[model samples]
Target: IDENLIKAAQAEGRVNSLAMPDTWANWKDTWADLKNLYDIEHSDTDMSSAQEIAKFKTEKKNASGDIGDVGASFGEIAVKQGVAQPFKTSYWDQIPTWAKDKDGNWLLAYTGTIAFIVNKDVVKDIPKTWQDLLKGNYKITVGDVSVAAQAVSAVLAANYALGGDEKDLSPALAFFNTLAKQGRLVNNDVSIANLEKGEVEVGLVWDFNGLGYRDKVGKDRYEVLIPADGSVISGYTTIINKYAKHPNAAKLAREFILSDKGQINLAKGYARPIRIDHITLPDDIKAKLLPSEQYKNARAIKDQKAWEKSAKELPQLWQEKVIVDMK
Candidate 1:
């Protein structure tokens, strides 16, 4: 146990978080455990990664929130924005080099892969890969590519499956443009409600989200696939606010999130724990996730620097190419 961290955190009494909703990634259980064990009061305001960073900077000395869970891609941006404070947790040695910042400004707690959530009832034949999707007759719902991180990653995943890289999204745009021409593309937001109501046959979404939605809609009704050819695997990292009101509590929260207990709680919600190899999950908890072998073809961004540059140009490129072709 980190006695110093615990003592300091106990003195603080409370910790405020952002972008870490209770319903997402089984954060509810983690929060309950933290309060029960350490007597630390907690509250969270759910926001997007971009919004969280903005709040940290804009709030500055008035920053009420102590920590945030943001997309992995935004972790570097947070550090670059000079709003993140570094604190390498005890489990830092267990984390993969690629999943964490060297100075510990941010570290991923759980990861999600881009996947296809197919409503089997609406489509007789399930599409297992990007090629299958391209040839399918059903309308596909890919959320707003210009803003939504998940949707943007879906495009990158497509590019990966087609033997392209972050520098070139031509293959991905061309594929979707073909779908647009065929009148099989629906550029609307993809949600559990939309899937349940059969508003869309296929949805491109994160693996955890798809699993949660499937369970919500009823098991065996929807099929989640990792897109056989390739997909993008991304994670959510914790960023400590440099000017947080409860600095010690924030550090303690980050430590607790990487602990064995926290990893299991995330698995319960189908988010693959980043420290998966370091801990032993219960049989039922393990069952909640997709088979590990299924991720053989999937990958995380090899060069975040390259990705940041490409991701910036995505909105314009998507608007000019894919969106223009959509009916």
Candidate 2:
């Protein structure tokens, strides 16, 4: 609940916080924390993921926010620009190496997996495998496949579903092509309305979002599955601005975020904590989630630069080959 805590701290004169709009799902928590914790003051600006790094560098040069959460790759950009300060939280030792930078400038607070969410009531049989999904008549929403880690994870999921590995996406591309050919590809926001209305039959989404939606919409109506083949495990990190206005408060916030309490809060929001070993999840919550074994083959992908370069080419390729095939 770092978001709420930040607001609490700010209200009690703890620290100043600023954030990127719609950058993360839980951004509302950040706002809540800021408004509750300190004097709420910030310059609002909308920027792309890449632009967020530039904004942090420019605004933080003179010190503004005490802490911020950014895409894991963006955290690297911040470190390369020397805009992030290093401060390892107390729970640092428990974090996996793939989820953090060696210098402690950035660390993934939660890990996410790309998964399939099925609406069961509308369909009699549940598709347990991605291959099963392909053989069925169903619509899938990949979201704005043009932005963010979520899109990449979707591609990776397809790849795995088609027998590709973490480093290979050709299978995923081919799989999407098949879906597109069948007029089953949906490109839009993964809306609760669409899902509730049964407009979407099966879709790939982040683990937390899918799980949260299933819980919100009703477990009987929705089911989350890690495709029998595999899925991508991506980490979202948090970084402390180097020139923070309330450095101590920021450090404290980071510390609390990595603790069991913080992890539990994140889990409550359906974002699995990086410190998975430390938290004791409720059985009911556990029952509603996919088993950890579902992630056995799941692993974080690296080579951010390569990923960006590859992503730049995905949209055009998808349009020219996949989308056109849909028509």
Candidate 3:
């Protein structure tokens, strides 16, 4: 938005990014805008969140990366590692407090919450709450918690619904334990194919992914909703490398991302914008998402440190407490 920033970015020539593939969340559109509007050249080296942060720290004085997109939790990780710098965009006031750092080190562009996607052909009665899930006689499948972020968040969501914080996963563990012992917990991936083949009666997945899958088969044949009780929400944020080769271009890129056009681009990709409440979506795009009413009780994690510690212990805990019953 600032003329000086645009000029500075133009002077810098190109923007180097990390962990941002053109396909994810429709990042290509944003790249197109930056190039057309400011003549900024762009390139990305895709990598994991951890790898991106490590690159920033390792490169330091020789930094070629300008910015990167990483998991929500990594915002603090980048800040703590001291490899990321702060740059609050023009729309800072509209962003959720939990989705951003107070000092503006990193800010979420899009968010997601754990939601249930039920195959209508398989389920006579859809479950809208965790309480309903507990009463299910049909199979319940959550992708492997050890391997998938969605599954891990699903566990956290169930725990939040049943009154557990980031520190104690017992509420979720016991919930899964009951499902395992009852022979209702099935180990199945929530692929669209599985759901379309009448395999997944109740699939736990991210709201966005579920929405995409629901439409892929037939929207009327599937139902997606946030648990009526409570749930956990996570998102992805963009971090500017402190020793960036094009600091001005990096800042400008962030500014455009938080703008209305940028937010809409992400919504088009099915990722909820951090400024959802502040921006209006087209009717068709809005139709792809669940009603706002479903998110009344949904929340973001407050205790990151406690959660990371707990998550590391999850693979073992899941194996011992839940999986043991499966055998």
Candidate 4:
């Protein structure tokens, strides 16, 4: 909170991140603020939550990424894996206890509702509901449900659409299995690279990521929408590497992200800020998000503990039910 921290971060001069890509959750704004305010340059390697943690653990002393943002489930996974370190910022007390790690290895900054990012160029029919998705003939892109938090949550979202809760993912398991058996399922991460290249016809992703991807690619070429029938809402947390090359800079980056301006920046990208109760968003930023009615059927996780257990078991279940039949 004082002395050598800011000076040390400035001395480090750079903060490389993973999974905190320019588009997702509008991390670009925060990256720019770090550069503008503290003269720290930044770069990011886009990856899934599992990949980021693997990089942290595998790289260790050779670490390059100072910080990374991952899904709700990965925060605890990172800490438990012994790959994360604590850095509770000056703003720590303000964050809800439920949204952060007790030891500060990671904490939620924003939340996301699952949505479909459909490429119009691939097909004439655009899916508006879960039923529509099931009926589509085009390839369906889902990230590695084994490790990717978004992919795991996508299953939960689909299950909700089919009248299932966090405890039973079988409803959605059967959904993706159906796609696999029909030869419509594509086992690949939903990324800007893949989506921009036209490799993805239909990608299940967070609404914020979909919106960001839609903006980066031609908005006219893509349509972003919440699943009309149902969806599940979840959040992401930033984990600082235990072996961060720029440790102080990483701490500063995390601090800046939890700041008022940082929270507003995320909202501008359509990710609902985690500190929504305490901060007021400007009209323009608030209006940038999807209309309220689009979220009429979206459900926030009712039981965090129950969802956690299911989320932990999701990857293995994905392998058994969905991937086993996937082409």
Best candidate according to TM-score: 4
**Residue-wise C-alpha lDDT for candidate 4, range 1-327, written one tens digit per residue:** 465887999998899999887777888898999999888899899888888999999999789788988888778788888889998887888888778878888889999999998998886889988889878789888878877889889889999999999877888899889999999987777788887799899899999989888888878988888989999899999999999999999998988888898998898888888888878888876555677888989998887777878888888888888878966
Better of 3 and 4 by lDDT: 4
Q: Using TM-score, rank the candidates from best to worst.
A: 4, 1, 2, 3
User: Candidate 2 residues 198-308, lDDT tens each?
Assistant: 787877788887877776577788888787676777766766778776666677667766877667767766777899897886665676567977887666666666554
Checking candidate 4 for backbone clashes, the offending pairs are none
lDDT of 1 by residue, 110-133 (tens): 999999989888889899899998
Error of 2 at 172 (Å): 1.2
TM-score of each: 0.88, 0.74, 0.73, 0.93
Worst 10 residues of 2 by lDDT: 41-50
Show the colliding residue pairs in model 2: 7-33, 7-36, 7-37, 8-37, 9-37, 10-37, 10-38, 11-37, 11-38, 159-172
Candidate 1 ranges beyond 4 A from true positions: 180-189, 291-293
Clashing pairs in 1: none
User: What clash count does candidate 3 reach?
Assistant: 0
Lowest summed lDDT across 10 adjacent residues in model 4 is found at 282-291
The runs of at least 3 residues in candidate 4 whose Cα sits more than 4 Å from the true structure, single-residue gaps closed, are 1-3
Ranked by lDDT from best down, the candidates are 4, 1, 3, 2
Candidate 1 deviation (Cα RMSD): 2.5
Please report how far candidate 3 places residue 249 from its true position, in Å: 4.3
Number of the top-ranking candidate, with lDDT as the measure: 4
lDDT of each: 0.86, 0.68, 0.84, 0.86
C-alpha lDDT of candidate 1 relative to the true structure: 0.86
